[PDB]
């Protein structure tokens, strides 16, 4: 049996309600030890070692946790055959993409969560954990980048996102589809992500204890410029725009971000629309404003890649080339 | 013997052009309503069409003043026509549609339409979209359904309709509760109507209003700044909508700022950046303890529309939560 | 607390394998009392009684069980406040539509199953059954036709279909959307079906012991006319065509069906395409041939309505009017 | 300095038309490949296009003869051109695409295209679909991805592509594993390629083949007749595909007819009427005991293509299962 390390961070998968009958819950109260021997069947497919990194709801995920995870994985790579990270669902898709760019281990790294409390009727977390361990154990999972395993599906860390606030089936790679499906402890892989990931990216966080400051502003009818201005006034390194339609900006936001970009703030146009690329060549002259188009990266994904691009360059053309390769 | 249909034009890519039929480049102010209407001569087989230019903007620059002008016009002119079609940019068409759905007192058909391809592009979607919009507005079965959006041969209620994709001609969907009807051969089979209260069944009356309460939206993500939320509180915003993570959760620092603002009277609505599903009561956030409101299926930009209108009526969070359960 | 009757028919919800972590299972050997006390929380929301009607896999569902179920619901309507029917997934969409057309009882009738057997890790059956009893107990559920409740969702019996072979979230109302979502035992209903159902249909099976014979033929490139001919030779009352695209037929199948319709066989054009109407006024002049256009009914749903239509009329124009109203 | 691109025309609504732009009615494959081309002058900006008419039929009448003809012509003319577009009806485009995906030995781009609206209708999709199909066939990056379908600005692999909606312009989706890339402003960002073996990586050779093994499809449902199954068996079909219920299950009487056929030599594949997901092994059916093959993600019309070609190599059920695990 392969050795698999579980790195725990908290989440609904470690968290419970007063009741199985009721929807209410508190996040990340169970330790990884307790999580693992609640699924005795993991012992049939791996030798599982648990380590607790942090124990938070993922709605409070942060750069320090990210840097701890990436360095822990890169250091401990030769000690184990694969990793599974137990994590809250709310921001699993951001951590997954961060790790997808910063992990240099080409062994399987699999993230997993639960949409129901571990005390709830028909709790999803047990079988999710089991399938995550199946994926991390499968020799075919290597060299695919950092993965998310939810609802019997293996999803790439770059495309995966949430489709629904509560559904057990919420995690989907909404633009390019999944990599494979898990049935009876076996995976039929038919896809791998063509974007460069893991050991094929320049991003190296081994000596970083903080990341560039990147905030996200929303566009909508009558949008205030005050959020954008607040990030500019604090000296943020970059701003991501959650654009309306194909990455478009409300006029007051457009003005503020055009000004910021002139003074060297990196600006990435993404979209609040859940699927499709924010393209070049549409209504915005990105060349002229010094903006970057996010492509299929949603706002929170574009934040991950922009924070990391800014560790290598402040140059908008070079950042755009980063957004075309990773 | 054909219905009288008014077109209220606001601009949008439907009225927009670039220099090549086969390059994506375009701008939005290009074609007036007269020229828009005359380019689809098949309209005169189904309706007597009159066109009025209300504004001419990209809907990325839609704003409270345009909403108020459109509601008051539709309400004032209800008796002069059999139905209304509004040409509009796609980017914020879902927000305008919900604003009209809550403030229009006319129960004749109001249908919104736009185009995901410019008028000059090969296989331009705007002509057939506008034709189907006029079909919808002329169908007496369209009445009493609220304000509608018609795109890609589908009839969508103004509450649930939203964009699913940045560029796809099929992007407009009612992602939580489905469409009202599909259009085939100029006929509609309706199998649904929205249960939530709309148009003449709301208390929202903008007839005397010249501005709306100030509501901002803040995004949640890992390591989110509280600076956007703090800037809105410092500017005296009447309400703030949180685009939460998962089931409407907030990053700790955002949470701390909004819990403080709610104590001082700021209306706070928790919604979700996740494109489908309710932001529910009775999950991780004790809304009754902080004075917060859960948005239900209303996404952040929709939640903004209803909160602005709620704040014309009340400042009490229990009353705003009741509005969010009924409209 | 309301009185809820569980009419059990078998299915995966009552199905079991040899391991929590192997996909193998069988149906048809586990009784309703086992399901009811796998969900002790039911006692918090209802006074439940279980009756075993049959114990089958729904792949073997048939006209006799349909007739049994409609009669029993219609007969026992006064004895309870609502019904839940436990049922296999595979043909749940057929039974739900039959009962939507034939039940005259004014109380909630809710169907439920499970995509994982009762023995699996993270079995979906217990919370589905709890949510189905919440649904049947909800006064707001009345007057909405026969319902299916799967994965925290209330689906109408006409539109509901399977979208995926294995996904717990497979059940969707793919053309018109769900009626309501369930969270913390509460439903927010925002829709009701416009098509006529239950006590508003002329279908009455109270004394029928069989149903007219209606079979389904599939269309594809180089399709054999031998399936269609085998139904015609056997004197079938009706044939449903799973059409290509918008209800189209391969030349040989069309010829066999145009002939059958001239002898008085009823022919409904439906589509193998899983969403969208088979329309009138496309490539097939239905009036010229004596054919009926299924609208949004998929082939197996079209068979349900065609069987019931033939209990009243053999007339093509009258059958089309039934396909326009139910 | 432009690629040479060959258009092979087969008919389909992308060629012919209704009496009207306003009305839904139409007749299929009445325009020659030549109308098609001249109808899109911008093709000359991106390629040197030459058209040949192979057949001129509605794709609801696609057949084994057209498949053989197409595969042989593409394998013959591979050396003469830089890539192929095939204009085809929508209705069975997904079966011809998998067929060519398994039989074409040319690793130059082969892209299939159609139109969900008649050539004569308002906002016809056929022109820009054809532009995009030519863009795909011209893009050096499209080589070695197997046979493609290009519809609604999306590049789809031949194996997974299928119809999702009877009439929507956006009906074509790779419903299990997603598209290979999206087309904007005439450029494609490929992020995927299919891992299943195709074109020159398959043993299927139709070059000397004037017919295919007989494979029929049977439908399952509540109270399913065994008479369709019995009929194909009586006619000594080489293969039967079951469109099963749920995860490839069969009605008792169909099960028993197909069990009996498999024990005497007939190749039996369980597929599913359910539009997504695999028909798996190790569910309710002991496939090894009955001599059945599980179709995986192949829907019944797709499973028929693969079973016919497998039967040109082998009759052995464990060998057909190996082909169903590999292509």
DSSP C279-319: -SSSSS-HHHHTEEE-BT--HHHHHHHHHHHHTT---HHHH
Reported resolution in A?
1.9
Cβ-based contacts under 8 A for chains B and D: 67
* HSE, side-chain direction, 13 A CA sphere, residue C247: 26
* Residue D59 assigned as binding residue: yes
**CB nearest to B231's CB, from A24, A166, A226:** A226
Pick from B244, B280, B264: nearest CA to B317? B264
Contacts of C242 in chain D (CB under 8 A): 219, 243, 273
Q: What 3-state DSSP class applies to C277?
A: coil
Report which DSSP code applies to D61. G
Please give the tally of structural domains in chain B: 2
Are the beta carbons of C151 and A169 separated by less than 8 Å? yes
What's the 3-state SS for chain B?
A: CCCEEEEEEEECHHHCECCCCCCCCCECCCCCHHHHHHCCHHHHHCCEEEEEEEEEECHHHCCHHHHHHHHHHHHHHHHHCCEEEEECCCCCHHHHHHHHHHHCCCCCCEEEECCCCCCCCCCCCHHHHHHHHHHHHHCHHHCCCCCEEEECCEEEECCCEEECECCCCCCEEECCCCCCEEEECCEEEECCCCCCCCHHHCCCCCCCCCCCCCEEEEECCCCCCCHHHHHHHHCCCCEEEEEEECCCECCHHHHHHHHHHHHCCCEEEEEECCCECCECCCCCCCHHHHCEEECECCCHHHHHHHHHHHHCCCCCHHHHHHHHHHC
Q: Which among A5, A9, A12, A91 is annotated as catalytic?
A: A12
Q: Determine, yes or no, domain membership for A118.
A: yes
Q: Are residues B12 and B82 in the same domain?
A: yes
Pick from D269, D270, D258: nearest CA to D226? D258
Whole-angstrom distance, CA of residue B197 vs CA of residue B158: 12
Q: Determine, yes or no, domain membership for A207.
A: no
Both tokens of residue D195?
């891992």
Q: Which residues contact C122 (CB under 8 A, 6 or more apart)?
A: A122, A123, A124, A125, A126, A127, A128, C116
**CB nearest to D251's CB, from C59, C220, C231:** C59
Contacts of B122 in chain D (CB under 8 A): 40, 42, 127-128, 131
Handedness of CA B70, B74, B76, B77 (dihedral sign): positive
Interface test with D, best of C24, C69, C114, C226 (most D CBs within 10 A): C226
Q: Are residues B157 and B15 in the same domain?
A: yes
Whole-angstrom distance, CA of residue D312 vs CA of residue D206: 9
Q: Determine, yes or no, domain membership for B210.
A: no
Conformational region of residue C185, where left means phi above 0, alpha means psi within -120 to 50, and beta covers everything else:
left
Both tokens of residue B120?
């000059």
Contacts of A116 in chain C (CB under 8 A): 127
Are the beta carbons of B170 and D167 separated by less than 8 Å? no
Q: What residue has token string 């049977």?
A: D218
- Pair type for strands C109-112 and C83-86: parallel
* Concatenated DSSP letters of D195-227: -S--GGGS----TT-S----EEEEE--TT--SH
Q: Are C120 and C128 in contact (CB under 8 A)?
A: no
Whole-angstrom distance, CA of residue A235 vs CA of residue B97: 37
Q: Are residues C185 and C288 in the same domain?
A: no
The percent helix, strand, coil of chain C (3-state, each to 5) is 35, 25, 40
- Other residues' Cβ atoms within 10 Å of the Cβ of residue B35: 12
Whole-angstrom distance, CA of residue A223 vs CA of residue D97: 47
Both tokens of residue B134?
């006029």
CATH number at residue B12: 3.40.50.1170
* Residue D91 assigned as binding residue: yes
Q: Are B105 and B26 in contact (CB under 8 A)?
A: no
Helices B64-77 and B93-103: crossing angle in degrees, nearest 10, is 50
The torsion angles phi and psi of C208, rounded to 5 degrees, stand at: -85, 140
Contacts of D193 in chain A (CB under 8 A): 194
Residues of B with CB under 8 A from a CB of D: 21-25, 40, 42, 45, 121-129, 131, 152-153, 167-170, 182, 184-186
Report which DSSP code applies to C275. B
Both tokens of residue A23?
């929807």
Both tokens of residue B82?
């059999």
- Other residues' Cβ atoms within 10 Å of the Cβ of residue B213: 17
Pick from A117, A121, A97: nearest CA to A109? A97
The Cα diameter of chain B in Å comes to: 63
Question: How far from the centroid of its chain's Cα atoms is residue D31's Cα?
Answer: 23
Whole-angstrom distance, CA of residue C155 vs CA of residue C171: 8
Looking at CA atoms only, how far is residue A79 from chain C in angstroms?
Answer: 28
Looking at CA atoms only, how far is residue B279 from chain C in angstroms?
Answer: 10
Looking at CA atoms only, how far is residue D122 from chain B in angstroms?
Answer: 5
Whole-angstrom distance, CA of residue C258 vs CA of residue B99: 52
Q: Are B148 and B138 in contact (CB under 8 A)?
A: no
A215 beta partners: A239
Interface test with C, best of D273, D280, D289 (most C CBs within 10 A): D273
* A21: nearest CA partner in chain C: C41
Pick from D171, C176, C161, C274: nearest CA to B179? C176
Q: What 3-state DSSP class applies to C149?
A: strand
Whole-angstrom distance, CA of residue B302 vs CA of residue B147: 14
Q: Which residues contact C97 (CB under 8 A, 6 or more apart)?
A: C146, C157, C158, C301, C304, C305
* Concatenated DSSP letters of C67-105: HHHHHHHHHHGGG-S-EEEE--STTHHHHHHHHHHH---
Give CA angle at B194 (B193, B198), nearest 5°: 120
Conformational region of residue A108, where left means phi above 0, alpha means psi within -120 to 50, and beta covers everything else:
beta
Alpha-carbon torsion angle B63, B67, B70, B72, nearest 10: -130
- Other residues' Cβ atoms within 10 Å of the Cβ of residue D41: 12
Decide: residue D141, CB within 10 A, 0-12 exposed, 13-18 middle, 19+ buried.
middle
Whole-angstrom distance, CA of residue B228 vs CA of residue B257: 10
Are the beta carbons of A300 and B248 separated by less than 8 Å? no
Interface test with B, best of C145, C158, C191 (most B CBs within 10 A): C191
Q: Determine, yes or no, domain membership for B311.
A: yes
The DSSP H or E segment spanning D156 is strand D154-157
Q: Which among B13, B87, B103, B266 is annotated as catalytic?
A: B13
Both tokens of residue B254?
């955002």
Q: Are residues D186 and D229 in the same domain?
A: no
Interface test with C, best of A18, A21, A185 (most C CBs within 10 A): A21
* A224: nearest CA partner in chain B: B216
Whole-angstrom distance, CA of residue B255 vs CA of residue B270: 10
Q: Are C165 and C129 in contact (CB under 8 A)?
A: no
Looking at CA atoms only, how far is residue C185 from chain A in angstroms?
Answer: 7
Decide: residue B126, CB within 10 A, 0-12 exposed, 13-18 middle, 19+ buried.
buried
The DSSP H or E segment spanning C32 is helix C32-37
Q: Are residues C21 and C166 in the same domain?
A: yes
Are the beta carbons of D177 and A178 separated by less than 8 Å? yes
Q: Which residue positions of B form the known binding site for substrate?
A: 59-60, 90-91
Whole-angstrom distance, CA of residue B74 vs CA of residue C98: 45
Contacts of D244 in chain C (CB under 8 A): 59, 90
- Other residues' Cβ atoms within 10 Å of the Cβ of residue C285: 11
Q: Determine, yes or no, domain membership for A205.
A: no
Q: Determine, yes or no, domain membership for A60.
A: yes
Q: Which among C12, C80, C102, C153 is annotated as catalytic?
A: C12
Are the beta carbons of B123 and D128 separated by less than 8 Å? yes
Both tokens of residue A319?
């950042």
Reported for D286-291, long-range contacts at CB under 8 A and 24+ positions apart, including other chains, are D287/D321, D288/D318, D290/D258, D290/D259, D290/D262, D290/D263, D291/D262, D291/D263, D291/D317
Residues of A with CB under 8 A from a CB of D: 159, 173, 175-178, 181, 183-184, 188-195, 276-277, 279-281, 295-296, 324
- Pair type for strands A109-112 and A147-150: parallel
Are the beta carbons of C184 and B280 separated by less than 8 Å? yes
Write down the number of H helices and E strands in chain D: 9, 14
* B26: nearest CA partner in chain D: D185
Whole-angstrom distance, CA of residue B93 vs CA of residue B90: 5
Question: How far from the centroid of its chain's Cα atoms is residue D150's Cα?
Answer: 12
Q: Which residues contact A47 (CB under 8 A, 6 or more apart)?
A: A1, A2, A3, A4
Report which DSSP code applies to C24. -
Q: Are residues D161 and D283 in the same domain?
A: no
Q: Are residues A194 and A237 in the same domain?
A: no
Give CA angle at D318 (D316, D319), nearest 5°: 65
Both tokens of residue D74?
């593409």
Q: Are residues B254 and B283 in the same domain?
A: yes
The DSSP H or E segment spanning D149 is strand D148-151
Give CA angle at A185 (A181, A189), nearest 5°: 35
Whole-angstrom distance, CA of residue D9 vs CA of residue A287: 41
Alpha-carbon torsion angle D64, D69, D72, D75, nearest 10: -110
* HSE, side-chain direction, 13 A CA sphere, residue D217: 29
* Concatenated DSSP letters of C156-222: ETTTEEE-BSS-TT-EEETTT--SEEEETTEEEE-----S--GGGS----TT-SS---EEEEE--TT
Whole-angstrom distance, CA of residue C216 vs CA of residue C311: 18
Q: What 3-state DSSP class applies to D267?
A: strand
Looking at CA atoms only, how far is residue D18 from chain B in angstroms?
Answer: 12
Whole-angstrom distance, CA of residue C256 vs CA of residue C261: 9
Q: What 3-state DSSP class applies to D85?
A: strand
The torsion angles phi and psi of C171, rounded to 5 degrees, stand at: -75, 120
* Concatenated DSSP letters of D157-172: ETTTEEE-BSS-TT-E
Q: Which residues contact D239 (CB under 8 A, 6 or more apart)?
A: D213, D214, D215, D216, D266, D267, D268, D269, D304, D307, D308, D311
Domain termination residue (choose one: D170, D201, D232): D201
**CB nearest to D243's CB, from C218, C223, C244:** C218
Gaps in chain D following residue numbers (C to N > 2.5 A): none
Q: Determine, yes or no, domain membership for C206.
A: no
Both tokens of residue A1?
């049996």
Annotated catalytic residues of D are: 13
What's the 3-state SS for chain A?
A: CCEEEEEEEECHHHCECCCCCCCCCECCCCCHHHHHHCCHHHHHCCEEEEEEEEEECHHHCCHHHHHHHHHHHHHHHHHCCEEEEECCCCCHHHHHHHHHHHCCCCCCEEEECCCCCCCCCCCCHHHHHHHHHHHHHCHHHCCCCCEEEECCEEEECCCEEECECCCCCCEEECCCCCCEEEECCEEEECCCCCCCCHHHCCCCCCCCCCCCCEEEEECCCCCCCHHHHHHHHCCCCEEEEEEECCCECCHHHHHHHHHHHHCCCEEEEEECCCECCECCCCCCCHHHHCEEECECCCHHHHHHHHHHHCCCCCCHHHHHHHHCCC
Cβ-based contacts under 8 A for chains C and D: 214
Q: Are residues C131 and C159 in the same domain?
A: yes
The residue count of chain C comes to: 326
**CB nearest to D164's CB, from C91, C275, C278:** C275
Are the beta carbons of A245 and B26 separated by less than 8 Å? no
Decide: residue B143, CB within 10 A, 0-12 exposed, 13-18 middle, 19+ buried.
middle
- Pair type for strands D172-174 and D181-184: unpaired
Domain hosting A224: range is 214-323
Q: Are A74 and A101 in contact (CB under 8 A)?
A: no
Decide: residue D38, CB within 10 A, 0-12 exposed, 13-18 middle, 19+ buried.
exposed
Both tokens of residue A34?
């307790």
B253 beta partners: none
Domain termination residue (choose one: C167, C200, C233): C200
The torsion angles phi and psi of D161, rounded to 5 degrees, stand at: -65, 145
Q: Are residues D31 and D158 in the same domain?
A: yes
Q: Are residues A255 and A132 in the same domain?
A: no
Domain termination residue (choose one: D160, D175, D201): D201
Q: Determine, yes or no, domain membership for D208.
A: no
Are the beta carbons of B125 and D122 separated by less than 8 Å? no
The torsion angles phi and psi of A248, rounded to 5 degrees, stand at: -85, 160
Whole-angstrom distance, CA of residue C187 vs CA of residue C134: 8
Q: What residue has token string 């909004």?
A: B258
Both tokens of residue A66?
């990210």
Both tokens of residue B63?
């704003």
Q: What 3-state DSSP class applies to D240?
A: strand
Looking at CA atoms only, how far is residue D245 from chain C in angstroms?
Answer: 5
Looking at CA atoms only, how far is residue C169 from chain A in angstroms?
Answer: 6
Report which DSSP code applies to D245. B
Gaps in chain A following residue numbers (C to N > 2.5 A): none
Q: What residue has token string 């137990």?
A: A86
CATH number at residue B239: 3.40.50.40
Q: Are residues C143 and C186 in the same domain?
A: yes
Whole-angstrom distance, CA of residue D162 vs CA of residue D276: 10
The DSSP H or E segment spanning D228 is helix D227-234
**CB nearest to B127's CB, from D45, D123, D127:** D123
Q: Which residues contact B219 (CB under 8 A, 6 or more apart)?
A: A216, A217, A218, A242, A299, B228, B243, B273
């Amino acid at each position: 049996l392969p050795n698999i390390t579980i790195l725990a961070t908290g989440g609904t998968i470690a968290g419970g309600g007063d009741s199985a009958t009721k929807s209410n819950y508190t996040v990340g109260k169970v330790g990884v030890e307790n999580l693992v021997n609640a699924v005795p069947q993991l012992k049939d497919i791996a030798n599982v070692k648990g380590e607790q990194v942090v124990n938070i709801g993922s709605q409070d995920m942060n750069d320090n946790v990210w840097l701890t995870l990436a360095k822990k994985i890169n250091t401990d790579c030769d000690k184990t055959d694969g990793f599974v990270i137990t994590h809250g669902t709310d921001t699993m898709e951001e951590t997954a993409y961060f790790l997808d760019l910063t992990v240099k281990c080409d062994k399987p790294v699999v993230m997993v969560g639960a949409m129901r409390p571990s005390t709830s009727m028909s709790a999803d977390g047990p079988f999710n954990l089991y399938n995550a361990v199946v994926t991390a154990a499968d020799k075919a999972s290597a060299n695919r980048g950092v993965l998310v395993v939810m609802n019997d599906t293996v999803l790439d860390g770059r495309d995966v996102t949430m489709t629904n606030t509560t559904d057990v089936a919420t995690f989907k790679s909404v633009n390019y589809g999944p990599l494979g499906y898990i049935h009876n402890g076996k995976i039929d892989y038919q896809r791998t992500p063509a974007r460069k990931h893991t050991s094929d990216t320049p991003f190296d966080v081994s000596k970083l204890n903080e990341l560039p400051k990147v905030g996200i502003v929303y566009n909508y009818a009558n949008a205030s410029d005050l959020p954008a201005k607040a990030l500019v006034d604090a000296g943020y390194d970059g701003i991501v725009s959650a654009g309306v339609g194909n990455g478009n900006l409300y006029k007051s936001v457009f003005d503020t971000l055009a000004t910021a970009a002139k003074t060297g703030t990196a600006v990435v146009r993404s979209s609040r629309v859940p699927t499709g690329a924010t393209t070049q060549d549409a209504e915005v002259d990105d060349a002229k404003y010094g903006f970057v188009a996010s492509g299929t990266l949603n706002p929170q994904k574009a934040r991950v890649l922009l924070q990391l691009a800014l560790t290598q360059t402040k140059d908008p053309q070079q950042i755009q080339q980063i957004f075309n390769q990773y």
